[PDB]
Design a protein around this ligand. Structure first.
Ligand SMILES: [Zn+2]
Ligand SMILES: [Zn+2]
Ligand SMILES: [Zn+2]
Lengths: 262, 115, 44, 66
């Protein structure tokens, strides 16, 4: 049909695959769109009802702002900016609440699995903070002893990764093409040997070695890319790849309709 | 005070278009276009595929300053063939190719999920 | 509840001279009772 | 201070892993480089944070406020 795709391996959290019959700008733009443009959900504004702990308030704000959130059903709701409402209706936002107490004699931790959804969830799978390990605790927030109190009111909104790294799903990326340098898009700094002084790529063996003596294949062109996507976990990885493709084409179609309407 | 934040980084033109169509005066059938709220992640793609098309003669994009999320693009081509038609052909090519890529990806993803 | 003075949570509710050296404590420095007023933040 | 959430370079969540990385060094008597490997942080931009973060929060915490 066109740009074929081959999966090398996959997991719960990362997809590694091969991309062929494609051009360089296409692949690179896909990379950047995945790293910057995926809409998601994240906690955004926070009201301290009561802080007592040694930990500072804007730490509590900033460190809250970075907890990843469940965002399968992110498309169902809409932006707070475009929303018909004002001040965080259920159909544009979600509300989070935290409670802590210095109960024990020893220090008590406050994990992400303590904040609870409050507002109308309206049956769409949104907002539950991800627990990656197998021991129930989310990610650590704050510690308390015997007298400190936290009472937090939190509001999440849409947001995208372009204006803050909160709203990223991307978390890493990988990229490689022509591991054998047949395209001569670089030449190696060295002092005895390029071949000896550089480690071989891991992706060398999926293409043949350069056959040693044949002249420079000038007419050739880059293809056959090597991607490894590894999401943070706010959304499954197949979803992030497909959504990135979808939002890139949504952008291009938008520019097309703007042109036609002009 | 009036120092801009990141709201103007990608929100499309408030009381403004998405793009301008201004004719060059230095070569026959040349147009410059000014997109805004976009950057390399679209410009490089459009330029590369439009250059892949054969009927055009010149296609290059630049961003003027990284403080501003706008960038320009200049197209000239041989007679009869309109540059705007060239651009819309390019966009149709892009939408088709990566729609094919998408469908191919769900097929192989569902296949790799065993059974 | 208007003053703190110490490790004790003595809510002095002070008007004038109600043993600023608070009864459970012996401090005389009178710290001042973080508000109940609702505060805003911005977790950008 | 706590461990950071989300490595500055990469973005992967870190902070779930902290007390785990502790008890990998308390009872398991394990070498720490292998401890981070078995914790599963194969890039090194993520790895620097757990290896170099200091925990001042409990040294703060041993006061008696209120
Ligand atoms: Zn709303
Ligand atoms: Zn006292
Ligand atoms: Zn990292």
């Amino acid at each position: 049909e066109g740009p074929q795709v081959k999966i090398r391996e996959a997991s719960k959290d990362n997809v590694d695959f091969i991309l062929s019959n494609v051009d360089l700008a296409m692949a690179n733009s896909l990379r950047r769109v995945m790293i910057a443009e995926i809409p998601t959900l994240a906690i955004d504004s926070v009201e301290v009802e009561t802080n007592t702990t040694v930990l500072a308030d804007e730490f509590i704000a900033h460190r809250l702002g970075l907890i990843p959130l469940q965002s399968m059903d992110i498309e169902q709701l809409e932006y707070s900016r475009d929303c018909f409402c004002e001040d965080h209706c259920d159909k544009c936002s979600v509300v989070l609440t935290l409670q802590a107490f210095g109960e024990s004699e020893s220090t008590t931790n406050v994990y992400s699995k303590d904040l609870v959804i409050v507002s109308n969830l309206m049956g769409r799978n949104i907002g539950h903070p991800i627990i990656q390990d197998k021991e129930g605790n989310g990610v650590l927030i704050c510690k308390l002893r015997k007298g400190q109190e936290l009472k937090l009111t939190c509001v999440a909104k849409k947001g995208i990764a372009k204006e803050h790294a909160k709203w990223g799903p991307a978390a890493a990326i990988e990229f490689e093409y022509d591991p054998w340098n047949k395209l001569k898009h670089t030449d190696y700094w060295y002092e005895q040997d390029s071949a000896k002084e550089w480690p071989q790529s891991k992706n060398c063996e999926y293409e043949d070695p350069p056959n040693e003596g044949d002249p420079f294949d000038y007419k050739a062109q880059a293809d056959t890319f090597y991607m490894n996507v590894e999401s943070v976990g706010s959304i499954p990885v197949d979803q992030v790849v497909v959504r990135g493709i979808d939002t890139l084409q949504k952008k291009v179609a938008s520019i097309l309709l703007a042109l036609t309407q002009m | 005070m009036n120092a801009p934040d990141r709201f103007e980084l990608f929100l499309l033109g408030e009381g403004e278009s998405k793009l301008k169509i201004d004719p060059d005066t230095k070569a026959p059938n040349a147009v410059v276009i000014t997109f805004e709220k976009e950057d390399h992640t679209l410009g490089n793609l459009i330029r590369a595929e439009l250059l892949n098309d054969r009927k055009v003669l010149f296609a290059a994009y630049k961003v003027e300053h990284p403080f501003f999320a706008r960038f320009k693009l200049r197209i000239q081509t041989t007679e009869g063939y309109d540059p705007k038609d060239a651009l819309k052909n390019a966009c149709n090519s892009i939408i088709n190719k990566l729609g094919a890529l998408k469908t191919n990806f769900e097929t192989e993803w569902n296949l790799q999920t065993l059974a | 509840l208007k003053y703190i003075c110490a490790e004790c949570s003595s809510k002095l509710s002070l008007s004038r001279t109600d043993a600023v050296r608070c009864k459970d404590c012996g401090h005389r420095i009178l710290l001042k009772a973080r508000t109940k007023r609702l505060v805003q933040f911005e977790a950008r | 201070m706590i461990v950071p959430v989300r490595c500055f370079s990469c973005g992967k969540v870190v902070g779930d892993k902290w007390e785990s990385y502790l008890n990998l060094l308390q009872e398991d008597e394990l070498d720490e480089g292998t401890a981070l490997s078995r914790l599963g942080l194969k890039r090194y931009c993520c790895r620097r944070m757990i290896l170099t973060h200091v925990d001042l929060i409990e040294k703060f915490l041993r006061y008696n406020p209120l």
